[PDB]
């Protein structure tokens, strides 16, 4: 999320793909 | 002019700075918006427009 930003949805962008975007804050909530 | 146009369409702007390096025209218009100060999300929300 430090490299990519959130904008729009998936039903407009032509050629959009599916992948899990990593979150650096996500392993911080595990502790 | 056809050799310079085919490099502009298929390879973007990298064909003049070296070898022809291809990039899609949807990615070419999105990255030239960043040169003029436009966020690239404006393109894909209006690509049919």
Curated annotation (Swiss-Prot), chain A:
<feature type="glycosylation site" description="N-linked (GlcNAc...) (complex) asparagine; by host">
    <location>
        <position position="18"/>
    </location>
</feature>
<protein>
    <recommendedName>
        <fullName>Spike protein S2'</fullName>
    </recommendedName>
</protein>
<comment type="function">
    <text>Subunit of the fusion protein that is processed upon entry into the host cell. Mediates fusion of the virion and cellular membranes by functioning as a class I viral fusion protein. Contains a viral fusion peptide that is unmasked after S2 cleavage. This cleavage can occur at the cell membrane by host TMPRSS2 or during endocytosis by host CSTL. In either case, this triggers an extensive and irreversible conformational change that leads to fusion of the viral envelope with the cellular cytoplasmic membrane, releasing viral genomic RNA into the host cell cytoplasm.</text>
</comment>
